[PDB]
């Protein structure tokens, strides 16, 4: 009964103001940091803004470091975004997604494990680079299919590595399947398998089914901005 929902999107003018809200439920809100993820029309992810478990420090990416500002009500357990100075490049879904880092040891970096169902925003008229590859790729049912991703620099750090994979269906957020590059998530299906390293990753369906039509995101956590790949499209021949 974990539940994020999103509320506040709006239409709104060049230069102006919007305030975000993402309201918790079922767990212990102050246990955990949180992020808002922005889903642009090109499909890319984007995080926008993180803060830690207590609220007190807070990052924010070069795209929007002076006009956006997350906070954290614990008492309320809801999440926020004041955003400001708005521009073209902000139209987007805004997702709150909650940081899982398990298990934790020394240098352990987490990951995505819950999302609300995002709020539309629409503004009128040294990162690490993952690139993904293929696109686009189609299957037949009981094939395999093999999604490559490539960071611009290593995203390992203490023996392991902070590669994601996440999958996306229409209309829903997404959805982790494997974090640190080859754990599988509780509630996976033993059909998704990652592996790799350093700065070369893979993920593996085997068999193909036709619940797996989805596009397939990586995202690494090695380093500040997390950042994602730009989605493979996985459809049936």
């Not at 987007?92 to 909650?98: P, Q, V």
């Not at 790729?137 to 590669?163: H, K, P, W």
């Not at 994979?165 to 640190?180: A, D, F, M, N, S």
């Amino acid at each position: 009964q974990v539940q994020l929902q999103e509320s506040g999107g709006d239409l709104v003018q060049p230069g102006g103001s919007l305030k975000l809200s993402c309201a918790a439920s079922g767990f212990t809100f102050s246990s955990y940091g949180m992020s808002w993820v922005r889903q642009t029309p090109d499909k890319r992810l984007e995080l926008v803004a993180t803060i830690n478990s207590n609220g007190g420090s807070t990052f924010y990416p070069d795209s929007v470091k002076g006009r956006f500002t997350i906070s954290r009500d614990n008492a309320k357990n809801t999440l926020y975004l004041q955003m400001s100075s708005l521009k073209s490049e902000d139209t987007a879904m805004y997702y709150c997604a909650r940081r899982r880092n398990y298990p934790y040891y020394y240098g352990s970096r987490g990951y995505f494990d819950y999302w609300g169902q995002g709020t539309t925003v629409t503004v009128s008229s040294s990162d690490i680079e993952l690139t993904q590859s293929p696109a686009s790729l189609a299957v037949s049912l009981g094939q395999r299919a093999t999604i490559s991703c490539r960071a611009s620099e290593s995203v390992d750090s203490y023996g392991n590595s902070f590669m994601h994979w996440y999958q996306q269906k229409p209309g829903q957020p997404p959805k982790l399947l494997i974090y640190r590059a080859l754990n599988l998530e509780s509630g996976i299906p033993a059909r998704f398998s990652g592996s790799g390293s350093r700065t070369d990753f893979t993920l593996t369906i085997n068999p193909v089914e036709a619940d797996d039509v989805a596009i397939y995101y990586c995202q690494q956590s090695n380093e500040d901005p997390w950042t994602f790949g730009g989605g493979t499209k996985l459809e049936i021949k």
